[PDB]
């Protein structure tokens, strides 16, 4: 059929992938709101250098 279907380095600890993929996703969120003082996931706060008005 297809000789290209294969695992390259054995198994994957599944949950730890979902555990890590969220650990570094929130790290990108922290880097985001530490650049512009504005929580991206909750789109609200101030306190820093921003002004923010609808």
């Amino acid at each position: 059929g297809s000789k290209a279907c294969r695992r390259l380095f054995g198994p994957v600890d599944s949950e730890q992938l979902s555990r890590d993929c969220d650990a570094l996703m929130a790290g990108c969120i922290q880097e985001a709101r530490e650049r512009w003082n504005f929580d991206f996931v909750t789109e609200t706060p101030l306190e820093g250098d921003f002004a923010w008005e609808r």
């Binding site: 297809s2 000789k3 290209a4 279907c5 294969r6 695992r7 390259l8 380095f9 054995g10 198994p11 994957v12 600890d13 599944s14 992938l17 979902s18 993929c21 969220d22 570094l24 996703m25 990108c28």
Partner: protein, 244 residues
């Protein structure tokens, strides 16, 4: 004014190329589990996926540009190295192909080691880490730009294009693809393609000597640095053919 207007485009292609560039020293500094041998192993797999799926010739080298750049910023586990390569192809196929690769079909190519929920969750992590800088300058861009200046017939342009595209794919599996910018990889592939495969005597309207001096002038690397990039390529062709 095609002489300046083509350098107008080429100046912009070389400046944007300098942004989507990885660091050649991420094996020692960033990655712990990942070794240079393991990159060729996952790159060979990604190449076969694009071969079987009849992908656009741009999809595989673009996906490797994402791989080298992500490995230049974050450490990846040995087990998760394949998951990273599948995610890079998932985004690169969206950028170039009309109908991209389905996330299910990509997980089948991983022998179902990963799941679609893991590929999509990695897609956000990869694109966020690349600062959404996905429209990277590709070697195919420079190849198509160089051919427009070569006064060869269209039948010979297409056979040069196929050989040059093939030489770019072999480069993406070697560690030379990391340090060399797409301008060098594209130009070195063209000059290695215009020599044919030593199959026939090279008969071309633009001389090979004039083509090497022209390419080495615009992409800015002296002929000694252009032939060195070509000899690496023909070495990769020798290593590719030997492993068969």
């Amino acid at each position: 004014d095609a002489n300046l207007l083509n350098d107008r485009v080429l100046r912009a292609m070389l400046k944007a190329e300098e942004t989507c560039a990885p660091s050649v020293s991420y094996f020692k500094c960033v990655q712990k589990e990942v070794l240079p041998s393991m990159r060729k192993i996952v790159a060979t797999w990604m190449l076969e996926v694009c071969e079987e799926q009849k992908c656009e010739e741009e999809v595989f080298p673009l996906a490797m540009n994402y791989l080298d750049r992500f490995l230049s910023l974050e450490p990846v586990k040995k087990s998760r190295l394949q998951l990273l390569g599948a995610t890079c192809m998932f985004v690169a196929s969206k950028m170039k192909e009309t109908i991209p690769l389905t996330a299910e079909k990509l997980c089948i190519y991983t022998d179902n080691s990963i799941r679609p929920e893991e590929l999509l969750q990695m897609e956000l992590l990869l694109v966020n880490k690349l600062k959404w800088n996905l429209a990277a300058m590709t070697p195919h861009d420079f190849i198509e730009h160089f051919l427009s200046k070569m006064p060869e017939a269209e039948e010979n342009k297409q056979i040069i294009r196929k050989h040059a595209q093939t030489f770019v794919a072999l480069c993406a599996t070697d560690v030379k693809f990391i340090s060399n910018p797409p301008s060098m990889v594209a130009a070195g592939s063209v000059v290695a393609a215009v020599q044919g495969l030593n199959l026939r005597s090279p008969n071309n309207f633009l001389s090979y000597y004039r083509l090497t001096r022209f390419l080495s002038r615009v992409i800015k690397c002296d002929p000694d640095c252009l032939r060195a990039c070509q000899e690496q390529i023909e070495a990769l062709l020798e290593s590719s053919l030997r492993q068969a």
